[PDB]
Design a protein around this ligand. Structure first.
Ligand code: 6GF
Ligand code: 6GF
Ligand code: 6GF
Ligand code: 6GF
Ligand code: 6GF
Ligand code: NAG
Ligand code: NAG
Ligand code: NAG
Ligand code: NAG
Ligand code: NAG
Lengths: 218, 213, 218, 212, 213
C-alpha cells in the first residue's frame, strides 16, 4: 500500500522476513521451471574505443529482473517494495563472455524487492570488451556485440532473456560522449561447446555506434 | 553539553545505544515521510580535464546530513556528539548518475551523530565524470554538471536537497590548482524514466570553472 | 536425474550436505593417491604483447576439474549438479610460475559439483606473463610458455594433468583479436630446485600465436 | 622487565588483556581532556613532482603516538611492549586535508603497545597531494604544505600536535631520490569552517625541497 | 611417514591441532630467545628500471622460514607436512624499508607446516623500490640494495638470517628479462634511529644487474 510505504517498522519487518526466507546461494526455481532472468543493458557512455585492438570501454546500467515468490508478502497494509543489500539475496551469476576487464560496479549494491516476489537489480557497470570496432569512424558505424549469460547455470536452470529488442537508449546515453548510438539490439542466443553437453542461454547485445561529428571527406 | 564531551564511559554508552537502536539497512523514515537528505559538494581539486573525451577527474567533500530521531539521546550531562563507523549506521544510497569511475573515498569512514538524532557524514571523494568540458580554456569556462541522488529510493522514500544553492567554494577549493572556479550552483531536480513509475529526486551540481590564465 | 534438477529444496539440501562434508583447507586425497587435478587453458583474448619487455597480457578460461568422492550423493531422484561458492570448497592452489601480475578473476567465483563427486571450476582470468614474445610478427609466430602448478603441494599430494594436448582454441579465441592462435599445446612437466628435490607437477602451456597483417607498408 | 620480553605466554596474556580492555571505536579521553595525539612525518621518497598541476607523489612514515592508560599493565616481571594489529585498537582518524589520492599503506598494520599505555603506530604511506610546487628547480626550492588532522574529532576531543618542529629528515630520506630535502617544519595549526562551530587541530607539515 | 602423507583424516586432524595451538598474533619465541627468521629473496624478473628516478620494478620469491615447536607433532604414522592458510599462522611482519609500492602477492597465501614445527612460507611478490640504478648500462652494472626486516619487532624479538646460495640464480631468473643478474648478495645488517631505542635486524639484498648488451 502506497500510504504505508514509509512505515519504518513495517520495512524492518519485511527485511527480516526476506532474510529468513532468502537462500542467497540456491537458484529460485519455482514449479520445476528455469529461473527466468530478464536483462536489458542501457548504455550510458562509450569512453575508449580502439579500432586496432578491437576493444571498447563502456558504462551501462544492467537492468536485471527475476522472480522469487517465496519472498512475496501481503502488502495490503504495508510497503510494496523495499531496498535490500544483494548480499542477502540470490542474484544470477551473469557474466559477459567477451569481457576483458572486471565489471566495475559504480553504484550501491542494493536491489528492490517487490511484494509479489519480483526482484529488481540495476548496477552501473564500467567494463571493457573485445568486439568488432571496425566502421566506428563511418556513417554506418561499428557494431560491437556483447554476450551476457549465466556463468554456471545451463538453460534448464536459468534462462536469460532480453526485455526490449531495439532502442537507441536516448533517455540514458550521455549527450557529452564522443560517440553516438545508432541502435541497440538485444536478442536471445544460445551457446554450447564441444567439450560440454548442456546449452547456455544468453542475451546478445548489439551496440551499433559511431564517432560523433566526425570530419568527413565528401 | 560540551563540558561532558570527554567523558569516555558516556561516549562508550552512547555508541552502545546507537548500535542497539540503529537499523543500518532500513531508511529512517519518521512520521510516514521521506528521509530528508541534505547534500552539498565542496570541490577541493580538479585533477584532470580531458577535452578530447569530455571527462573530468575531481576531488570533493560530500557534505551529507539527515535525521534519525530514534538515535537521539538526552545530552544534558553527556556528550553532544560522537563519531561512529558508518557500517553501524544507515547511510543514504547516493550515487552520481553520470559517474564513470567508482567513488574513491580518501578519508576515515566515520560519521558524526548528534544527540538530537542528526547525522553528519562527509567523505572526501575522488571520482571521474562525463560532463561538458567545452570552453575550459576560455574566459567563460566550462560548466560540468554532476547529478547526485538515491540509487534505489524514489522521492516518497528519500528526498535529496541542496544545503545551499550558490557558492564560490573559496573556503575549500585549492589555491594551488591550475584551475579556478567561476561558480558552483546546486539545484533540486527530478528524474523519471519511461520504463518505470516513480520519480527520483536529485541534486544537480553545476561546476563552472576554467584554466587559470 | 535431470527431471529433478529444478527441485529447489533438493538443491538447498545438496548445498547443505556439501557444506557439512566439505573440508576447504584439506586436500581431498582418496585412497593414498595424490589428488589428480586436470587443467586446460582456453585462451580468449591476447590484449597486449610487449616486444620490448617480453610480456603478454591475456584472458583465458582455466578449465579445472578434480574429484572429491566424499561430496558425492545419490541423484536417482535429485539434481545431478549444483553451483557452489568456491569459498565452500577445497580448490587446488594453482599458480603460474612466470606470472608478473595477480590473476584477475573476471567471473562469478562458483564451481559446479556433480553428484559423483566431480568438481568443475572455470574462472575467466586476466593475467600478465613474462615469456618469449620474439617472432610474434612472423608467419611462424611467437611461442609464449606458461607453467602452471600447485604452489605448495608436491607430486605425491597433487598431480596436475593437461586434458587436451593440442588445439587452436577456435571455439574460444576471439575472432576480433588483432592476434591469431596457431596452436595451443599443454604438456605435463616436473619442476625441482637445488634447494628442494621434491618434484612439483605442472602443465606447460605453449601458446603459439602471431599478429594479423604482419606484412605492412613501412 | 627486559628478561621477560620473550616469555611467549606472557605476550599472549598481554594481548588478551589489551583486547578485553580496548574500545577500538571510542576515543581514549582521560580526565576530561582531549586525546593528545603526537604526529611527525618522515619523508622517505619524493617520487613525482608536477610544477604545472602543483601535485606531488611522496612516501612518508607517519610517526604517531598517544596514550590509553586503560591498556597499561604491571611489567615488573613481564614484557614491556607487544605488537598489536591496529584493528584491535583505537587509532586516531587522521587525514590529509589536501590529499588527492588514497593513503596507500606499504607496511604491516601493527602498532606497539607499551606497558604504561603508550601506543606507537608508524605506517609507511604513499600518497599524492595538491600543494605549491613552484620553485622546485631553484636553489631556495619549493615549499609543499600538507595539513594533517582528525577527520571527525574537534579540538575538545583530539589535539594533534607536532613532536619536532625542525628537521632535514637525514636518517630517513632516500639518498637515491632525484630530489633533496632542505627543511621540514611541522607546526600546530587550527582550522574552522563557516558551517561548523568547533575548531579542528592539525599539524601543518612544510616540506621545503628541490631537484638535485 | 611419507607413505601416510595422503591420509586425509590425518591431514584434517593435523590442521585441527595446528589451529588449536596456533597463536597467529603472538611471536613464537621459544626459550626466551628471538624468533630466528631465515629469509632470502630469489629474483625472478626485473621488469622496469628508471635510471633517472632511481626506481626498479621487480618480481622475487620471498623464501621464508622459522620454527614454532608448539606446532610440532609426531609423524611416525602420519603426514610429515601440510599446507596451512597463513591466516591461521603467525608470520613475520616483514617490510621493505625502501619499497615505494605495496608488495603485490601473486601466489596462493599458504604456508607449509612441518611435523617438527618448521614453517615454510614463500610468496611470489611484485614490488617497486627506490634504489641506486646508476651504472645499469655499464659492464659493472647497477647495484640496487633492498632492505627488508620486521616492521615492529626489534632484534631481541626477531632476528633475520639471509644466508643462502646464489649459483642457482639462473634456476629462478627469467631468461626473457631485458636485464641480467651479475650477483645477488644478501647479508645481515641492523638499523637504528636517533629517536628510538633498540636495533632492528634487516637483510640487505644487493641486486647487482645490468642491461643485456
Ligand atoms: C529488466 O529489469 C529492470 C530492472 C530495473 C529497471 C530500472 C530500475 C530503475 N530504478 C529502480 C531501481 C531498482 C533497482 C536498482 C536501481 N534502481 C530507478 C532508478 C532511477 C534513477 C537511478 C537509479 N534507479 N530505473 C530504471 N531506469 N530502470 C528496469 C528494468
Ligand atoms: C550538509 O551536511 C554537512 C555535513 C558535514 C559538514 C561539515 C562537517 C565538517 N566537519 C565535521 C565532520 C563531520 C562528519 C565527517 C567529517 N567531518 C569538520 C571537519 C573539518 C575538517 C576536516 C574534516 N571535518 N566540516 C565541514 N567543513 N563540513 C557540513 C554539512
Ligand atoms: C578440464 O576441466 C574442465 C572444467 C570445465 C569445463 C567447461 C565448463 C563449461 N561450462 C560449465 C561450467 C562449470 C563450472 C564453471 C563454469 N562453467 C559451461 C559454460 C558455458 C558458457 C560459459 C561458462 N561456462 N564450459 C566449458 N566450455 N568448459 C571444461 C573442462
Ligand atoms: C611520534 O610517535 C612516534 C611513533 C613511532 C616512532 C618510531 C618508531 C620506530 N620503530 C618502532 C615502531 C613502532 C610501531 C610501528 C612501527 N615501528 C622502529 C622501527 C625501525 C625500523 C622500521 C620500523 N620501525 N622507528 C622510528 N623511526 N620511529 C617515532 C615517533
Ligand atoms: C628460507 O626458507 C625457505 C622457504 C622456502 C623455500 C623454497 C620452497 C619451495 N617449495 C616449497 C614451498 C614451501 C612453501 C611455500 C611454497 N613452496 C617448492 C615449490 C616449487 C615450485 C613452486 C613453489 N614451491 N621452493 C623453493 N624454491 N624454495 C626455500 C627456503
Ligand atoms: C492481506 O491482508 C488483508 C488485511 O490484513 C486481508 O484483508 C487480505 O485478505 C489479505 N490478502 C490475502 C491474499 O490473504
Ligand atoms: C534530560 O536529562 C537531564 C539530566 O540528565 C534531566 O534533568 C532532564 O529532565 C532529562 N529530560 C529532558 C527531557 O531533558
Ligand atoms: C539411490 O536412491 C534411490 C532412490 O530411492 C534408490 O532406489 C537406491 O537405493 C539408491 N541407489 C544407489 C545407492 O545406487
Ligand atoms: C607489580 O608487580 C609486582 C610483582 O607482582 C608487585 O610486587 C608490585 O607491587 C607491582 N607494582 C605496582 C606498581 O603495583
Ligand atoms: C611417536 O608416535 C608413534 C605412534 O604415533 C609412537 O610409536 C612413538 O613412540 C612416538 N614417539 C616417538 C619419539 O617416535
Amino acid at each position: 500500500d502506497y500510504k504505508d510505504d514509509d512505515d519504518k517498522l513495517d520495512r524492518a519487518d519485511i527485511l527480516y522476513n526476506i532474510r529468513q526466507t532468502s537462500r542467497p546461494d540456491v537458484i529460485p526455481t519455482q514449479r520445476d521451471r528455469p529461473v527466468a532472468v530478464s536483462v536489458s543493458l542501457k548504455f550510458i557512455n562509450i569512453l575508449e574505443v580502439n579500432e586496432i585492438t578491437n576493444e571498447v570501454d563502456v558504462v551501462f546500467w544492467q537492468q536485471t529482473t527475476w522472480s522469487d515468490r517465496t519472498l512475496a508478502w501481503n502488502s495490503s497494509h504495508s510497503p510494496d517494495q523495499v531496498s535490500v543489500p544483494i548480499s542477502s539475496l540470490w542474484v544470477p551469476d551473469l557474466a559477459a563472455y567477451n569481457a576483458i576487464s572486471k565489471p566495475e560496479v559504480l553504484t550501491p549494491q542494493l536491489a528492490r524487492v517487490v511484494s509479489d516476489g519480483e526482484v529488481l537489480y540495476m548496477p552501473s557497470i564500467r567494463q571493457r570488451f573485445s568486439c568488432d570496432v571496425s566502421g566506428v569512424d563511418t556513417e554506418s558505424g561499428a557494431t560491437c556485440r556483447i554476450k551476457i549469460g549465466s556463468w554456471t547455470h545451463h538453460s534448464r536452470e536459468i534462462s536469460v532473456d532480453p526485455t526490449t529488442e531495439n532502442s537507441d537508449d536516448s533517455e540514458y546515453f550521455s549527450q557529452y560522449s564522443r560517440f553516438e548510438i545508432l541502435d541497440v539490439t538485444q536478442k536471445k542466443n544460445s551457446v554450447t561447446y564441444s567439450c560440454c553437453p548442456e546449452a547456455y542461454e544468453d542475451v546478445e547485445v548489439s551496440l551499433n555506434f559511431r564517432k560523433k561529428g566526425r570530419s568527413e571527406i565528401l
